[PDB]
Write an enzyme that holds these catalytic residues in place. Sequence first.
Site, PDB file in Angstrom:
ATOM      1  N   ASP A 216      50.490  30.638  14.837  1.00 53.47           N
ATOM      2  CA  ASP A 216      50.886  29.348  15.252  1.00 53.47           C
ATOM      3  C   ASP A 216      50.053  28.393  15.685  1.00 53.47           C
ATOM      4  OD1 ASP A 216      50.539  30.894  17.365  1.00 53.47           O
ATOM      5  OD2 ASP A 216      52.691  30.518  18.200  1.00 53.47           O
TER       6      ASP A 216
ATOM      7  N   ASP B 230      44.113  31.874  15.460  1.00 55.29           N
ATOM      8  CA  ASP B 230      44.850  32.859  14.709  1.00 55.29           C
ATOM      9  C   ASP B 230      44.356  33.138  13.327  1.00 55.29           C
ATOM     10  OD1 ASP B 230      45.573  30.474  13.532  1.00 55.29           O
ATOM     11  OD2 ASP B 230      47.547  30.602  14.150  1.00 55.29           O
TER      12      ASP B 230
ATOM     13  N   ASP C 161      53.393  36.149  17.663  1.00 49.39           N
ATOM     14  CA  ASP C 161      52.508  35.442  18.466  1.00 49.39           C
ATOM     15  C   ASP C 161      53.610  34.673  19.532  1.00 49.39           C
ATOM     16  OD1 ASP C 161      50.435  33.999  20.043  1.00 49.39           O
ATOM     17  OD2 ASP C 161      49.122  34.214  18.648  1.00 49.39           O
TER      18      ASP C 161
END
Length: 1026
Positions: A735, A739, A425
């Site tokens: 992060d 997510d 990501d």
Amino acid sequence: RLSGYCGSPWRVIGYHVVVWMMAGIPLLLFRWKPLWGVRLRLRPCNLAHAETLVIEIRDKEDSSWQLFTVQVQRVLRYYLFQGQRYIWIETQQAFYQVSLLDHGRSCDDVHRSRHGLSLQDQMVRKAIYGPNVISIPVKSYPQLLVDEALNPYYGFQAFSIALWLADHYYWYALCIFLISSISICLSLYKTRKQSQTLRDMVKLSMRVCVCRPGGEEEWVDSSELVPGDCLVLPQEGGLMPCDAALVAGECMVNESSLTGESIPVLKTALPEGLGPYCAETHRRHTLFCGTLILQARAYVGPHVLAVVTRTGFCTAKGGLVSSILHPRPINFKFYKHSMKFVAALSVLALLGTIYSIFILYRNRVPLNEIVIRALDLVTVVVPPALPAAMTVCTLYAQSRLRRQGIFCIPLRINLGGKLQLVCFDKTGTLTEDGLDVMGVVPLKGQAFLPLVPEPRRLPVGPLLRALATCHALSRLQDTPVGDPMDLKMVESTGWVLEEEPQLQAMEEPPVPVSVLHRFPFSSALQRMSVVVAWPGATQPEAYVKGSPELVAGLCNPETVPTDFAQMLQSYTAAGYRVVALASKPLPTRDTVEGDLSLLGLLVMRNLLKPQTTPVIQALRRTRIRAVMVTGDNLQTAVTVARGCGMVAPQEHLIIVHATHPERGQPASLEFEPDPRSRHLALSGPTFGIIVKHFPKLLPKVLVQGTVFARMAPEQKTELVCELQKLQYCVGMCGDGANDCGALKAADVGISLSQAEASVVSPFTSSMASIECVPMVIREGRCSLDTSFSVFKYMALYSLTQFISVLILYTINTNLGDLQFLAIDLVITTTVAVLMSRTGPALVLGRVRPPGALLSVPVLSSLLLQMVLVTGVQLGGYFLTLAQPWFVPLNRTVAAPDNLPNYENTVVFSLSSFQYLILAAAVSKGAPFRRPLYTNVPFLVALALLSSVLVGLVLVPGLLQGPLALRNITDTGFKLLLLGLVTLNFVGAFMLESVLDQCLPACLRRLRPKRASKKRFKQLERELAEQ
């Protein structure tokens, strides 16, 4: 997945309720294929009227469970199953789902006007929901000991102990019992560790203040709390018992340790007088259990208060922990591939045992004693040390996680053995959390001229107030904190907010600026709105900021510059990020996003971590495809790809325009057919429609997909589900807050910036870097081979033990008791424990680990080793004729008292050398771990083992009586012994150095094999067809 709820309420008079006491123990049979008569086990067929015993036919399920009475104290029956709660329904039959037909919808009139329930026999409310506490069931030490003793292996070990006691050999029984005891203690420790580590997450109860109708205020424990009851914040500081909905006002909440990113998110009361609200809108106006509260606005006289709506295991917090205990989904891989190997071993053992028993029966040996000897010979198949030694390697490897990352909770660590994909990501993993100001361009004074872009506070006007009041900072007797981007914007102007005393800026030259309402920056809408008003203003002015892609659409079409595409894409080539601002003087909630007018653009800088490029480049050498998932603007990943060199040779993407129903989407050259040889880039809006449209193109397009742009978080779960359906094992790095949605069960991943003792997911390390991925990869790959090594060691040890015992039985001579222990105590357990102390290899594996066992090459290698071991070294029967000795007194007593037997001494002496050399050779390996000498404990163990073993072959000294050793007639007779042992020593290495070669594959290089595996056929077709 559904099944019926049939059962028999009592159907027991008995009178036969006691006749089954002596019946055969049937519980183990029902656990597998209950069709053998599970119904006979007090499960007659009957109707569904007040079923004390409830069972499900598992018509579409492969598992079943049973729950029973009793219900507390019209009366509605209920039961607890896997933490879920159900309540009987009077109008219909059977039970019904909890929450009394709510399903997120209810009469908002009375619900909004929460005047406090007037104690309407709360016992009924308690029964339906139970106590408002979470307590994972914990079994006492005797309960855990007894319930784990039903394993068939333990029963076989107990039978072996009984037989060894019966055959007048109690010393072996003692060692077997000690092995069983150590296995029991280590299993108990393993069972304890997880439970006592996850128990700390259970927040303890505390006193809370709850308001009653009529104005009575009382303090009661959190247990009494029930959904729909009053709840007042404790002096605007503390902790929340459970989830609740804010009645009114604004509150500040954080979910750092429960959801992810620790950046506070503003919370506002849900709209009033609208109607039922589903779980989709809950996140906008719902609280979370076990979250710290910073401050709440006291807009109305009475202090802030909230009402609980969810309790028990059905809460959001409980859902994550629900996965604990019962696995869901079941293990991806089932170790049913060793049936051939175990069958081969069993048939070989049976053949050897029949040969040995026939030989013993020959020579007119008594038949009565044959049975016990045969049983002793066959007991060698499963030594008691197998389960204990095989289950300790994982525990020993787990010790690494404590020192080095990742910091994980246990069994699922092996799912990464055969991974072939990885994802990352770009939100915070590839860029620093803080952002650096680069410049800003206004759009006032000049109709469309670019002007000069630079970050300066000299210009004044609407932009100054827009930037000053556009943020979501929080303060507590210190400098403001919050999202790094917000603080980076606000610090540019230098204005500060301090103690209305909370909605007014400071250091305003033209006029003080205040705020009316504030909203968070949830990624769902990727935008935020704010109302700005100042004294003397004709009317309040609204301001909205967000991604430039969508602001233009909702704004006035005839306000944007004609060349706005060039303006927005000028900074894209440099890798920078650009945002757009808008404003409109709206006169006296979704209505404020109408025909807005853009006001300017702001460009930020996203510096890349210097340590990302080398680790990524090194990881790219393993021939594993890499993909990225992010919701950023069009491209903007070219600079990152160049830095890490993913699309360095070539790069291309797909057009984004797909509004028309035709969905004509030809390929684009970025900087003609579509061979897809290069790396393709997808888009969020296109991915949202192409998935369902033209499904035939999905399998051949998802494989080449590398990056995504402007994709919503809701597509992550769909993407991972699709990849799993495509038989693809991939991982992703998280992060932020949006997510963990795909981390539930599809399939694995990594996290960033997470607190210790995380329970949401079995991750992650503490370091804020992507350097953990190589670490977890290498530790996992070095952990996989431990199972193979221990299996090989156990198999070879069993084979040599069997051959030794069967060859020794050529005559009536039998080995004593302590001789077996001399090996089983310091040759089996010691090395088994030592091998678990290995570590990962510095050099990354160039090739993937072996697929799985059994395989032809390993069988060939092990059978070759066994035949070599059983070969020339058996010269103790033939070469002895060249030296003086006397034949043993065969038949004399047929007891182990035959101490002076010559054959027994030599075979016993060489058995230890055989075992140790086999253990040393089987563990040899260059990849996946450092050489054997890297481990100091293993070096000292083998050194002392050799030192104590070599003393036996050397002329024995005093105190040799207990060992039953005998002196050697000639001191020079050891020449043959040293010669043969050193020959075996050299031969082990010589063969191990050539067998590891590709000869098993070399002999079949002209392979006609064509394995698709649903991975190779796709690429073969793609390369064959343009």
